[PDB]
Coordinates of C-alpha atoms in Angstrom, one line a residue:
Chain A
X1 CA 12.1 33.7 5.9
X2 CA 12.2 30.5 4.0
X3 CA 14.3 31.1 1.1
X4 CA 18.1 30.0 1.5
X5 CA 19.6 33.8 2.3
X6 CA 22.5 33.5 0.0
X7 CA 20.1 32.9 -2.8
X8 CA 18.2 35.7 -2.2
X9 CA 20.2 38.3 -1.9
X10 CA 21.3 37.4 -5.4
X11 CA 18.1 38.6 -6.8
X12 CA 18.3 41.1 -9.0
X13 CA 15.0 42.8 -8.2
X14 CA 12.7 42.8 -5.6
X15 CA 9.0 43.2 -5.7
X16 CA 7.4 43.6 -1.8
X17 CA 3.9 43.6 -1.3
X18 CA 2.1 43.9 1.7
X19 CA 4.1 42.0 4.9
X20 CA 2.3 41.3 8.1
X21 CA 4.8 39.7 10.1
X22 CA 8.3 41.1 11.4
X23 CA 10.4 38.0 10.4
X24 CA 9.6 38.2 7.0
X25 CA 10.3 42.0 6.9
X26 CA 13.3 41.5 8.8
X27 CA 15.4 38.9 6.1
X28 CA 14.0 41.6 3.3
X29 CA 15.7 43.8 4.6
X30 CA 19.0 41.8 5.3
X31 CA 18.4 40.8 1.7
X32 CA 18.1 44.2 0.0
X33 CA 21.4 46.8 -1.3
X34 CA 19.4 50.0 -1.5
X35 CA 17.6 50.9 1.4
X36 CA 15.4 53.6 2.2
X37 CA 14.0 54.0 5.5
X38 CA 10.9 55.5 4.4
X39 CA 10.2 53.4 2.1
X40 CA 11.1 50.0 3.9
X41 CA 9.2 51.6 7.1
X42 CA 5.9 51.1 4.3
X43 CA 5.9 47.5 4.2
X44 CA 3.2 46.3 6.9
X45 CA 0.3 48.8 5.8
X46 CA 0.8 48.3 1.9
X47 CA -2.3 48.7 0.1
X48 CA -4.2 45.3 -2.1
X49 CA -2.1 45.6 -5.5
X50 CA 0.7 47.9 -4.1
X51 CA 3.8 46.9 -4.8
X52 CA 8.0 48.7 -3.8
X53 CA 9.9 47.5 -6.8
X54 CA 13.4 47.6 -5.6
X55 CA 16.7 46.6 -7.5
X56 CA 19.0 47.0 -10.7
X57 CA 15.6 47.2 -12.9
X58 CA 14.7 50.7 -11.7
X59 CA 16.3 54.1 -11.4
X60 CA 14.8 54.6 -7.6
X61 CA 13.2 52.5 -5.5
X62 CA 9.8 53.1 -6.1
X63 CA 6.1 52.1 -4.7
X64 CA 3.3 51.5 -7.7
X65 CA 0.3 50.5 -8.4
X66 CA 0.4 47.7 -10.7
X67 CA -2.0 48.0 -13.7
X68 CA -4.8 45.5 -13.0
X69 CA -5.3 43.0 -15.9
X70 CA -8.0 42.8 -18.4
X71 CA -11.4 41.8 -17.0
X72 CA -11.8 38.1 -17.6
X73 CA -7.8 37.1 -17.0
X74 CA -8.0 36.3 -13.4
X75 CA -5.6 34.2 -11.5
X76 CA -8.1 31.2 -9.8
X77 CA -7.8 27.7 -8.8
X78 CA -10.9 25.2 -9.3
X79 CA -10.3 24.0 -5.8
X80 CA -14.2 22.6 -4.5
X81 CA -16.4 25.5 -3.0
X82 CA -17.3 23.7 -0.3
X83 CA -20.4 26.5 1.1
X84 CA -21.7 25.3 -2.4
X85 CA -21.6 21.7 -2.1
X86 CA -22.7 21.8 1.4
X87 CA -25.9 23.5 1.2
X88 CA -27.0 21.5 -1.8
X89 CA -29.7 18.6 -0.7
X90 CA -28.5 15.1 0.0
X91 CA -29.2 12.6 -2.6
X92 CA -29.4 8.8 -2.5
X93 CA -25.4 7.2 -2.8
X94 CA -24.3 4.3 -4.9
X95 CA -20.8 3.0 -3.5
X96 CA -20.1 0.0 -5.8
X97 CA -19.5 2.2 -8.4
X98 CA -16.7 3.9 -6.1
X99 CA -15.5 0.4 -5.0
Chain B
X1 CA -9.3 9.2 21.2
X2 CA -10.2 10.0 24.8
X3 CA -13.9 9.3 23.9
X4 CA -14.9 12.7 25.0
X5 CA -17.6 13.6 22.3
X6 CA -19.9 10.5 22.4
X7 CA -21.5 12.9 25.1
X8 CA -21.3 15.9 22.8
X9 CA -23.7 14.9 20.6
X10 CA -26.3 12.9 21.9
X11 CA -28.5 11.6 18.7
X12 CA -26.9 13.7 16.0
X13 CA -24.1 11.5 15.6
X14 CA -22.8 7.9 14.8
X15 CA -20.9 6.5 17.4
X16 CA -18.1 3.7 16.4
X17 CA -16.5 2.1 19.7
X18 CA -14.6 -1.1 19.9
X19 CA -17.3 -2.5 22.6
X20 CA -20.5 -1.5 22.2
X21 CA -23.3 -1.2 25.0
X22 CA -26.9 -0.3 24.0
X23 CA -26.9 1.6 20.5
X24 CA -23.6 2.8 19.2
X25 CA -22.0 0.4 16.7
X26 CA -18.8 -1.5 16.2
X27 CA -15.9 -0.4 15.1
X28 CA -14.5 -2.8 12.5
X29 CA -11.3 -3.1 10.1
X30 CA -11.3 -6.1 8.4
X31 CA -7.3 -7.1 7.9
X32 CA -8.1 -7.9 4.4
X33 CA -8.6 -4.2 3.2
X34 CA -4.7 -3.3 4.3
X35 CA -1.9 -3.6 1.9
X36 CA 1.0 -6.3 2.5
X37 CA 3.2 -3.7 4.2
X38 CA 0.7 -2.3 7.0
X39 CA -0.4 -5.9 7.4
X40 CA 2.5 -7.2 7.9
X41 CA 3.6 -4.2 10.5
X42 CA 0.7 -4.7 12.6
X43 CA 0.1 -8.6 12.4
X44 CA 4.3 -10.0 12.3
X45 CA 5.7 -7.4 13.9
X46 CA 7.7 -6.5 10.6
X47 CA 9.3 -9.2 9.4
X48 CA 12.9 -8.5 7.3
X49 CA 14.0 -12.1 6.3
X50 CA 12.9 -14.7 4.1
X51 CA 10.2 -15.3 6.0
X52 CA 8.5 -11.8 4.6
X53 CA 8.9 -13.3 0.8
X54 CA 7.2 -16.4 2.4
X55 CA 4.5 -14.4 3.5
X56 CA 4.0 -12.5 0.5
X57 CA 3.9 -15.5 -1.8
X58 CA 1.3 -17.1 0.5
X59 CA -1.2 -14.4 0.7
X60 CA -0.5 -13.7 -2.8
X61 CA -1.7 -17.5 -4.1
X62 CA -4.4 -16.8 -1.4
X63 CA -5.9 -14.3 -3.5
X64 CA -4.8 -16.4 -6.1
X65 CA -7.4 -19.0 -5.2
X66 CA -10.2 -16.3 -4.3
X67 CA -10.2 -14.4 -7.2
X68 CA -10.5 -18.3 -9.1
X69 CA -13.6 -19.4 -6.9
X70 CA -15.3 -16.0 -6.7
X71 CA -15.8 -13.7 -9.6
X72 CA -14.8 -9.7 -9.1
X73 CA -15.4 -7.1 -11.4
X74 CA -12.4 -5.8 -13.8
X75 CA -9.8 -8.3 -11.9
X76 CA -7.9 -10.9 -13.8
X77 CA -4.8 -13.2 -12.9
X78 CA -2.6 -11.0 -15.3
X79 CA -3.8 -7.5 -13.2
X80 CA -3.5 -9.0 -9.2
X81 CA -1.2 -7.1 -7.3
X82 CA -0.6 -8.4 -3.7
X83 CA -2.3 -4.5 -2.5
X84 CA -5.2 -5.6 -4.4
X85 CA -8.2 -5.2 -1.7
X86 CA -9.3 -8.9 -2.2
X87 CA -10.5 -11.1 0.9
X88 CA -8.1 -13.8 2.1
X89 CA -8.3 -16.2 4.9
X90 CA -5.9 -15.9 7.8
X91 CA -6.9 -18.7 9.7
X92 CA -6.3 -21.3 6.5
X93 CA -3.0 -19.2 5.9
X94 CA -1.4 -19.6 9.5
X95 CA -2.4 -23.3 9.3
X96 CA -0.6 -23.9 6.4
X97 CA 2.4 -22.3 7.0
X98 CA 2.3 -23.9 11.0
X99 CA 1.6 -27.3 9.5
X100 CA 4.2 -27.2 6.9
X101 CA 6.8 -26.7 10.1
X102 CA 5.7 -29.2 13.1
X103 CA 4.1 -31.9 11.3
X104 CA 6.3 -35.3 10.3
X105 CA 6.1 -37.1 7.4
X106 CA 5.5 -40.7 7.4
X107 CA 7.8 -41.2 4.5
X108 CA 11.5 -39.9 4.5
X109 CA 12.7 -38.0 1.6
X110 CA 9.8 -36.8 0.2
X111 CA 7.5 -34.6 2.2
X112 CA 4.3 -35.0 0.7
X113 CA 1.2 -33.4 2.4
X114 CA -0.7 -37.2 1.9
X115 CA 1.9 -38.5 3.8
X116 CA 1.0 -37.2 7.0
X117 CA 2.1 -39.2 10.5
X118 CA -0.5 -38.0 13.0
X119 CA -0.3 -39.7 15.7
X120 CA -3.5 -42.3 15.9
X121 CA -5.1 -42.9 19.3
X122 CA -5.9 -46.5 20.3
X123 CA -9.1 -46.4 18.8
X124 CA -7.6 -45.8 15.7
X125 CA -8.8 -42.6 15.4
X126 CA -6.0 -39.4 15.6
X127 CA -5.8 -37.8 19.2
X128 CA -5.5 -34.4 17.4
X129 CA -6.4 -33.8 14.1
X130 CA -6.4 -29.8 14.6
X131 CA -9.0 -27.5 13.5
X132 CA -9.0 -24.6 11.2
X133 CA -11.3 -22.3 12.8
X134 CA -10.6 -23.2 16.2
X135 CA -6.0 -22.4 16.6
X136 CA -5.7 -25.7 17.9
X137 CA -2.9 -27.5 16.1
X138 CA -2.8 -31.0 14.7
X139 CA -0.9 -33.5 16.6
X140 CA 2.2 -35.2 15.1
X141 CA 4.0 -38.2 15.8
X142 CA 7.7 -38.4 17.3
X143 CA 10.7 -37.7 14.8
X144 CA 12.4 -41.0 14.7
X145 CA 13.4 -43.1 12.0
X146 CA 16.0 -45.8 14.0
X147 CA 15.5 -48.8 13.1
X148 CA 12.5 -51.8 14.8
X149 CA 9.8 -49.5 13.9
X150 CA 8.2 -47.2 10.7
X151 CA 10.9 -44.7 9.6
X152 CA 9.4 -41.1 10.3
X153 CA 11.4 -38.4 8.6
X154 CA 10.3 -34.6 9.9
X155 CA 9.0 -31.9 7.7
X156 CA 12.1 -30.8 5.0
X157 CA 10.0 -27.7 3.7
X158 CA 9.2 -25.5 6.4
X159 CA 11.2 -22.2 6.9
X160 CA 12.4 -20.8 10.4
X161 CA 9.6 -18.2 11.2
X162 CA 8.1 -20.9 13.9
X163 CA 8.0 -17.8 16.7
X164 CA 6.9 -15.1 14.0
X165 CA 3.6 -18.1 13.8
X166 CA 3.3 -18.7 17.3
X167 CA 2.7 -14.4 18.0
X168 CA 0.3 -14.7 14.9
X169 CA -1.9 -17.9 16.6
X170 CA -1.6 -15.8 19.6
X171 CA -3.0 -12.8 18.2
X172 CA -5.9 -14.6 16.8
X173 CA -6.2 -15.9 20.3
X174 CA -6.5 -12.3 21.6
X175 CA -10.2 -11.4 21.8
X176 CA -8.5 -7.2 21.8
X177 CA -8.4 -8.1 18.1
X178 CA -11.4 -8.8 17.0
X179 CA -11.9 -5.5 15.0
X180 CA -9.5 -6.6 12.9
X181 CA -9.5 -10.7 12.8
X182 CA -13.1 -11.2 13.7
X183 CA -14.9 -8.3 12.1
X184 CA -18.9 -8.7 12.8
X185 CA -20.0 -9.2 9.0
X186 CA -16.4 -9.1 7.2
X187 CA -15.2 -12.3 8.4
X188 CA -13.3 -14.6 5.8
X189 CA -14.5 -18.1 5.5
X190 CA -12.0 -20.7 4.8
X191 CA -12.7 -20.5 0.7
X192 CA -12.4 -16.9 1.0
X193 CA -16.1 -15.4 0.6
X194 CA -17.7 -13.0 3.4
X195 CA -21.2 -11.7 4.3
X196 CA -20.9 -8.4 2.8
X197 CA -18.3 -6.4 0.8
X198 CA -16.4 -3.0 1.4
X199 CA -18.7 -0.8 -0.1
Chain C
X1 CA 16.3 -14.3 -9.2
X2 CA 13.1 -16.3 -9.2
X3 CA 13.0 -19.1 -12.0
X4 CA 15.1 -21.8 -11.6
X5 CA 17.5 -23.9 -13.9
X6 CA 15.9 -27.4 -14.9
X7 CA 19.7 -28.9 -13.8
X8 CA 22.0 -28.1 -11.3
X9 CA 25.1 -26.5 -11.4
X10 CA 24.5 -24.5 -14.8
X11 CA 21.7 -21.5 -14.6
X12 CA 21.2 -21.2 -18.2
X13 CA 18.6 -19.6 -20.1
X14 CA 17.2 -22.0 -22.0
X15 CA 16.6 -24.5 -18.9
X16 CA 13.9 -22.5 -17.2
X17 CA 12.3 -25.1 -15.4
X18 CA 8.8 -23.2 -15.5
X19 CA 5.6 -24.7 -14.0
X20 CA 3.8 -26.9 -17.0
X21 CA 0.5 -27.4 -17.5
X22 CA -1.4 -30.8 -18.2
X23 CA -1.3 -30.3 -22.7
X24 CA 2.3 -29.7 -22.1
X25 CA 2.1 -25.7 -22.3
X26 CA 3.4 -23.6 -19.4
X27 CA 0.9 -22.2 -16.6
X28 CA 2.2 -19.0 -17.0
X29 CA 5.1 -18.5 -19.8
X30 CA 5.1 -14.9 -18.7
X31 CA 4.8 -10.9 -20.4
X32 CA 7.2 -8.0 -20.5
X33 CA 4.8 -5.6 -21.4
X34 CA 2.7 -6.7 -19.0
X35 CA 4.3 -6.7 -16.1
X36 CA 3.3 -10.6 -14.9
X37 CA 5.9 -12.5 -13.7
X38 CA 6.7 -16.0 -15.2
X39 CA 6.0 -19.4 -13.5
X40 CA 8.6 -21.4 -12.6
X41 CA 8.5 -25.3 -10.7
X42 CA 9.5 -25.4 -7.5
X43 CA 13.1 -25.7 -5.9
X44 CA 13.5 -29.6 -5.0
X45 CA 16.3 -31.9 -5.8
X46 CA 15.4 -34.7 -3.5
X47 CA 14.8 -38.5 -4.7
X48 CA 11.7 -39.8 -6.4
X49 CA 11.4 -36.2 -9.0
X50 CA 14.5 -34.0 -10.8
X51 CA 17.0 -32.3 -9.1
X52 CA 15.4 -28.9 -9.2
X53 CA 18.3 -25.8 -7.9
X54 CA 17.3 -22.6 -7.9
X55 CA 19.7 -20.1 -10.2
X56 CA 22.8 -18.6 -8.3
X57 CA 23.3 -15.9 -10.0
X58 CA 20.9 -13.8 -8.8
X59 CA 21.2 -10.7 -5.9
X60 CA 20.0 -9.2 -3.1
X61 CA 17.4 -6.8 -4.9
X62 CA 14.5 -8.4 -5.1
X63 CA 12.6 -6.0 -2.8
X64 CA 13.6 -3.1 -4.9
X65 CA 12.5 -5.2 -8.1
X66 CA 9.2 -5.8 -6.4
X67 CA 8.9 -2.2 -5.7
X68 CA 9.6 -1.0 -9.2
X69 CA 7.5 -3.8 -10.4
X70 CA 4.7 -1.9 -8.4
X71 CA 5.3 1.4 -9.8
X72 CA 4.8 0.3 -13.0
X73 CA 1.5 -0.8 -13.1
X74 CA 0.5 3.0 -11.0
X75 CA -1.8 5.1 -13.2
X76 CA -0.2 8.1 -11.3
X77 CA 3.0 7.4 -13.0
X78 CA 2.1 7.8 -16.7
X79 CA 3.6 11.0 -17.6
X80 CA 7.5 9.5 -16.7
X81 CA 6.6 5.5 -17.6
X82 CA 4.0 5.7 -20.3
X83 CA 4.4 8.5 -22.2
X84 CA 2.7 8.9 -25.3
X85 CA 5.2 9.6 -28.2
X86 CA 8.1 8.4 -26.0
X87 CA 6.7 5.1 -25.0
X88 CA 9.9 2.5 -25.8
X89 CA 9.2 -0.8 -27.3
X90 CA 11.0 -4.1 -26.4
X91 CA 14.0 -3.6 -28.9
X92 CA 14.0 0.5 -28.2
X93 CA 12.8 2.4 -30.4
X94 CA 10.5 5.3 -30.1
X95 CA 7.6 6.9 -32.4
X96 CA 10.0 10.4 -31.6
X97 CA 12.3 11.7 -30.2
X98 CA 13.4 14.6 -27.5
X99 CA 13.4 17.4 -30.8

């Protein structure tokens, strides 16, 4: 519901995962040439991995699985685990260092 | 910022006010630890002129002089910035740039600061020699170089940010501000060297 | 915008009226890959010392000097300032090129 309209509905293909709420749902919609009811009644209760590809790419809309990638190639950001840093026990500080 | 959850939690918690009663501490920013631009927003009232470049060179030969007298790890004349967290008097700074305004010069056309015409009392002694510490300005003589008496010539350096000055003495008048001008242990002596640090 | 012209009237070059030292030397002659600025004497053209005029040819940008100034010395700015290959000497030239 972001995305500048006009440049969206340039895109060739779409790819539509799960979408929980209705604004989102509603500019796909307004942003898509070959619609099936059926199919675009699916979005909200989409599996984890399903996908509708829909566009210029495909002969029919279409909802897939996507083939899961090879153990060990995982999407993941380093971000802190903070559960793991908290529960660790305090130790003694040294600020200068940090000033 | 309502002071809602002091109550909360009773002992499982440090408690920073700005006026402390039995056990909770102080809160205290020194003025030092704030860039140019934040310290000149909350101190002159944001300054646009002239005046601001007068300010900035100050403060910057201020840090100058402390970074000269008091020796600080990794930090050089070549690699001061004026954002460099380095303590600097304020007190010493507003009486400069305050003196170098009001105060006359006993000799015209040069304005030399050993050439300064206070105005002596009877005894001999000047009525107001003006304190550093204390915001009391110095006393000056009359501007008046006719002729039967000396020739006093006024000051022919100072700049027009008399009233930006006058706010900053008052602020430093203002016991509200004593978080930031008058922190407990952070306080800036006049050669520039406090209690503790900012770790 | 900042050093001044040893006489008045002309700004040129070559009579930067900088701050000198006791031995003769300047206090600060100044860097340009380091970013410290040069010291100058002051501005005063009354009796007793030299007429002293600041340069009139400079303009109104000193704050956005200042600010670039600033920038320059960031670490956070490496990858567009300091880059390693592309890093331009005083006389520009570079180690390589955009190939």
């Amino acid at each position: 519901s972001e995305i500048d309209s006009t440049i969206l509905s340039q895109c060739g293909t779409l790819f539509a995962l799960r979408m929980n709420n209705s604004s989102d749902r509603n500019h796909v919609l307004g942003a898509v040439s070959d619609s099936f009811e059926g199919l675009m009644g699916m979005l909200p209760t989409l599996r984890t991995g399903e996908a509708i590809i829909i566009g210029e790419s495909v002969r029919l809309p279409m909802r897939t699985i996507i083939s899961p990638p090879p153990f060990g190639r995982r999407p993941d950001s380093l971000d802190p685990d903070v559960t793991a840093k908290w529960s660790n026990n305090r130790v003694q500080g040294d600020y200068k260092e940090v000033l | 910022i309502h002071g809602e959850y002091a109550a909360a939690f009773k002992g499982k918690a440090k408690v920073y006010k700005v006026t402390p009663s039995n056990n909770e501490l102080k809160l205290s920013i020194p003025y030092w630890a704030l860039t140019c631009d934040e310290f000149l927003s909350v101190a002159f009232g944001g300054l646009e002129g002239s005046g601001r470049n007068a300010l900035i060179d100050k403060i910057y030969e201020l840090k100058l002089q402390t970074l000269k007298r008091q020796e600080y790890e990794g930090i050089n004349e070549d690699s001061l910035t004026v954002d460099t967290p380095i303590p600097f008097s304020i007190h010493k700074l507003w009486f400069d740039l305050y003196r170098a305004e009001i105060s006359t010069h006993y000799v015209q056309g040069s304005h030399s600061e050993e050439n300064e015409a206070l105005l002596l009392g009877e005894d001999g002694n000047p009525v107001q020699k003006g304190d550093s510490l204390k915001v009391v300005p110095p006393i000056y003589m009359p501007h008046t170089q006719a002729q039967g008496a000396t020739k006093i010539y006024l000051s022919n350096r100072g700049k027009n940010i008399r009233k930006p000055l006058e706010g900053l003495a008052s602020l430093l008048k203002d016991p509200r501000y004593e978080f930031l001008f008058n922190a407990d242990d952070w306080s800036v002596n006049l050669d520039g060297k406090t209690n503790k640090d900012l770790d």
